[PDB]
A paper describes a structure:
The mitochondrial ATP synthase is a membrane protein complex that generates most of the ATP in eukaryotic cells. The translocation of protons through the membrane-bound Fo part, mediated by subunit a, drives the rotation of a membrane-embedded c-ring and the attached central stalk, which together form the rotor. The torque of the rotor against the stator subunits induces conformational changes in the (αβ)3 headpiece, thereby triggering catalysis. To reveal how the mitochondrial ATP synthase is modulated by lipids and organised into a dimer shaping discoid cristae in Euglenozoan mitochondria, we determined the structure of the ATP synthase dimer from E. gracilis.
Symmetry expansion of the pseudo-C2-symmetric dimer particles was used to classify individual F1/c-ring monomers into rotational states 1, 2 and 3 and resolve structures at 3.0- to 3.9 Å resolution. Using masked refinement, maps of the membrane region, the rotor and the peripheral stalk tip were refined to 2.8 and 3.3 and 3.8 Å resolution, respectively, enabling the construction of atomic models. The C-terminal helix of euglenozoa-specific ATPEG1 (H5EG1) extends 50 Å from the membrane region into the lumen, where it interacts with the N-terminal extensions of subunit c, which together form a ten-stranded β-barrel protruding ~20 Å into the lumen. The N-terminal residues of subunit c (A24, I25) form a hydrophobic interface with hydrophobic residues (M148, M152, L155, I159, L163) of the amphipathic ATPEG1 helix. The position of the lumenal H5EG1 on the c-ring β-barrel remains largely unchanged in all three rotational states, suggesting a mechanism of transient rotor-stator interaction during c-ring rotation. The extensions of OSCP and subunit γ are conserved in Kinetoplastida, suggesting that the observed interaction is a structural feature of euglenozoan ATP synthases. Together, the matrix-exposed subunit γ/OSCP interactions and lumenal ATPEG1/c-ring contacts pin the F1/c-ring-complex to the stator, likely providing additional stability.
Author numbering:
A (entry chain H): 17 to 176
B (entry chain W), C (entry chain X), D (entry chain O), E (entry chain P), F (entry chain Q), G (entry chain V), ...: 24 to 104
L (entry chain G): 3 to 278
M (entry chain 0): 141 to 167
N (entry chain I): 2 to 67
Write the structure that this text describes.
Amino acid sequence: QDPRKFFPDNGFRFFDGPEDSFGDGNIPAQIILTLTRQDEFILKQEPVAAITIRTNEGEMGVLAGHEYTVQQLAPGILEVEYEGGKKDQYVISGGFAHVNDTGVVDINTVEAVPLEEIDHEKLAKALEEARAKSQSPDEAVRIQGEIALEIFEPLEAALH
Amino acid sequence: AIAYEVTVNGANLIGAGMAASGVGVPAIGVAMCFSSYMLAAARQPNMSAKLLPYCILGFALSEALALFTLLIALLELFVFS
Amino acid sequence: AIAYEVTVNGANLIGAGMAASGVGVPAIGVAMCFSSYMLAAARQPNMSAKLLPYCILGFALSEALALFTLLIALLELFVFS
Amino acid sequence: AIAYEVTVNGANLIGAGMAASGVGVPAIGVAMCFSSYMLAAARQPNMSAKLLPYCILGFALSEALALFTLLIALLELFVFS
Amino acid sequence: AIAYEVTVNGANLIGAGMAASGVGVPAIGVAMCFSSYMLAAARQPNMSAKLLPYCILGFALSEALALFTLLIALLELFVFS
Amino acid sequence: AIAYEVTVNGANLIGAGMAASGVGVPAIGVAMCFSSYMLAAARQPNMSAKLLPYCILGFALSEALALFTLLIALLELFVFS
Amino acid sequence: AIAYEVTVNGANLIGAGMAASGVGVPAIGVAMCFSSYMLAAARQPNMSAKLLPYCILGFALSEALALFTLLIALLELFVFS
Amino acid sequence: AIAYEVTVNGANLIGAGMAASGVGVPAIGVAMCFSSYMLAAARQPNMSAKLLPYCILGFALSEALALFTLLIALLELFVFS
Amino acid sequence: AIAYEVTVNGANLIGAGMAASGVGVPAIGVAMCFSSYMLAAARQPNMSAKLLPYCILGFALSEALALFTLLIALLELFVFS
Amino acid sequence: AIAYEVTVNGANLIGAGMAASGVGVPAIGVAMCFSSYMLAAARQPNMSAKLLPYCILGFALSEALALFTLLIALLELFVFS
Amino acid sequence: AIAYEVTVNGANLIGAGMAASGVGVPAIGVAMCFSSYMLAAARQPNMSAKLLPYCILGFALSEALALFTLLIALLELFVFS
Amino acid sequence: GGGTIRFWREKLEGYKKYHQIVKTIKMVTLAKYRQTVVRTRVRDQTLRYTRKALDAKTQDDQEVIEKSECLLYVPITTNRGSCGALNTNMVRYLQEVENPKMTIISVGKKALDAMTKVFQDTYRRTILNDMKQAMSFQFAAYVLEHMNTVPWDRAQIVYNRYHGAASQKLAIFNLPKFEDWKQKLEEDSAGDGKIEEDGLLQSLPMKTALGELEETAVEDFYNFHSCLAVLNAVSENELSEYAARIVAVENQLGNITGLMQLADYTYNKTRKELIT
Amino acid sequence: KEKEAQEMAVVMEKLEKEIQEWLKTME
Amino acid sequence: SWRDAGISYLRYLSIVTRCIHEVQKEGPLLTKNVRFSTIGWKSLYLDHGATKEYTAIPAELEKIPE
């Protein structure tokens, strides 16, 4: 018998993850952001001045040097403020935000699309449908309407 | 038995101190009612305006309890001989 | 044994201080009962209407204790000689 | 030795001040219970009806303590002389 | 030297006030127990049955310290004439 | 220098009032301990049995301190005249 | 009922002390308000300017209750003879 | 002037009622230390062997203060006249 | 009515204690303020400087209250006969 | 005017009670330090060696005050009359 | 009117008890300072160095308040009568 | 040689039709590969942090078979063949790894014919994705829901890594169970940070901040990151399928031409002989 | 009451003559 | 809510993603992204000689596994 011709690599080792160090000095003034939908990113280690996220407990803001905190992201939007005062918003579908003390943010979602690519006409027709779903007595429709509303109401608030 | 009615004219003042020991406590009730706004406004700024009535309401009732304590402590200084 | 019955009129007043000092404490109740509703409403705005009754209830049933503490400090100056 | 029994009538009232100070402290007990209900219902609305009994229970027991304190006050202002 | 034994009859009625100040401090305890049960069962409802004893068991003891504080006042007013 | 040895047979009682004011404060400790047990076991049910000994051991000495305070208060009525 | 009106001059002063003790209590509210501002602005730097008016207000009024409690304690030494 | 020395044989007791008020307030410290141990071991179960030394420490020394307070409330009744 | 003006010189020396009882409460405020600064700077160091002024402010004014309290306890000893 | 210098030989034994009422208040402010150590160690045990210097330092300087709150109560029974 | 100037010497000694009672409160501050520096130093060890100055500052000031309190309690036994 | 010559003619025409059919397959495959190579620009970024949660030192197999009670092996296979040596090498790895405690839920049609003939009773079922729609997060959620029918202690997601057009090698994701991952997470959060294996990252702050997170959210963390791992596996095997089929089709065309010159030599030789 | 206060009005008048008489000698 | 109803976190995220795809604008992005929500998948188990579907874990998100 051929002594184990096959020796497959470990797929995790291909990703150059960050080495979480304890720190010995100064604090960064801009964070290194990574935002990843399903597999493809949208931003690869971009320099950012700030980032504002939404969670279940409530909204949150992330400047550089922020403490280590891994945490949910509630379905809502996500604001990214670059160094030049500009901004960029992103509707997401849940995920996780991993913040390091080294100014290295890794946000990993299931979807991420800007506000520019969302319209109010195609949303005002979905909102009342979600509401009528929440009013139809049945678990298989009420929860679907609740979830759709959980995502839509932030967009109704932010598009205005 | 013997009977001695005495009118102490200094105890119109000691009490005015004790009541004033309870005028500063509702300050907590004020700050707790503004602090909880800031936090609630830092977690959800969209909810920054429809919470604010309850902030002022709790501040007002706490300040009103302090004002009643003070109305005693002044009613216990000037109107009594 | 001799018996001296003394009526100290000033003690009409000292206790009213001692009671007034316990009029500001319920503010920490009231404020908390509001400081919750903000934070709760920051945690789930869709429950903001289902929770205001259980806020006003503690508000009122703390101000009740405050008013029952103040009824003593007003039923001790003017009704007692 | 000599024997001077003395009856100080005003002590019918000073203590009623002190006892009146312990009526406002259970207000924190009521608020700490209603606020907890608010926060819990915010964190889990499905449980909002499963926790309401304990809210009323804790409030009632705290209010009963405050009421015993108020009994020692009002039963010390009037019936004693 | 001289030896004046005086028997004051108002200490029957002041200390009972002082003790009556301490009947409320167990209320915040009862409330903290019930509030903790609320928050815990919100965190994990499946434990709400394994936790209800230590809430109940935490009231009855924390309540007893009030009753004894209420014993003294009702053992210092009525029997100590 | 004229020596006046006064023996006040009422001060036996005021003390037992003041001490009673401290009998309720360990109640919040007892409830703190049970509350912490609840929140811990909610955070981790598997650690429900390992921590319960300390939940018993905190009550068992907070209550002991309150019992010593009550011993002082009751031993200031029935043994001293 | 023999009538002895007495003026205890030292009661000008003791009561002021009883008021001075209530001057430091609002400091905890001041600190609570500024602490809330800090923690909120950490939760959201972008809101750091929209919360500051709700601090200075909730501070100053909470500080006002420290002035009255002091004014009495100065309205009770210098003017009261 | 005229030198009137007085010895009040009741002050043996009144102050013992003050000291016994400060014997309960370390109970909240005991309960705080145990509560913190529970919450830590719920936060890090395998650290529950490395923290318990500090708990047992902060429980004892806190308690020691109470004992010292209690010592006065025993050193002020039975040995002083 | 018979008029006895009595001046208790020793009352220069008890209110000063009652004031000193409340000089340490603002220490809690200062500590709360610096502690909140530490926690916020932990959460976001870049806001630290932007939050450092308010901390200092929340220290001084709080502290200033204590100073006024302390001032009373120096104005109650050295100037009042 | 008439001049009575009165020496109360029992006051020695009352201030000790009021002083010992504060020996237990540093206890909560000691157990907070060890509680914080436990919580922090849970959050990061790697740092659990670098922190206990800032626990010990928060014990002695938070226990020594009790000593200076207690030594008075031992400097006020045994050296003074 | 009649004029009785009385000097109670024992008032050198009851007010120091109250001040010494107030010496223990700032401990709750000092710990709350260190208790924060631990937690912060857990959340952000890289900022463990830029927080210790604020820790020592808050501790020193919370201690200086107690130092002035104890200075009252000590300046009221030795120089005054 | 009438039968002979008509045989060579039919052979020639059959190969000339088979050539253009295979060329059509190649064109379709290029049109599906040039869409999905876009992933390469946008790769190696989403599991930048997942590994710190789930990665670990290389645990030997002979000890893990003892430590556990039911393993799981999820091979990502293809819905249609002509890939080359992807499916076969996966099966060779699995029958090299064969142990008394294994359970196989695969992904593809070609894990349904081979495995059941190789792994009779361990092999449970498969999952299928007709590739009309790009693969989603919820496909990997479906895969996780099928994985969680087994009370497994470890899951080895086998897949094919596209290192390049010429290199489609193997790769694995060794996912742990939840109730073991959590215990190891606590045990590693307590002790100091000393990496025990080169190439492994230090993640002690990660594992403390996760301790800061409640139970439901830690379960969600585990599920989310396991799903992202599964998703990258599916995407990589898709790209590798479309990158190996072109190779296994080019060599098919080479072999077909090698057959066709033989046919066209024997045809013309037989024809010339029949004329002579 | 009127009979109670009439003599009591003299009771205190008697008391104030004496008190001045005891004090103004020492005073 | 959806938790005690029995659906998992992943189904919830996928539902939210479907909603975002429902509302978002027409263009190359919707053309790209609806592919990440539309359902095509199955599970099949080979019986003695033939295939059969494992109908216990459904693809549609309105339903619950059983």
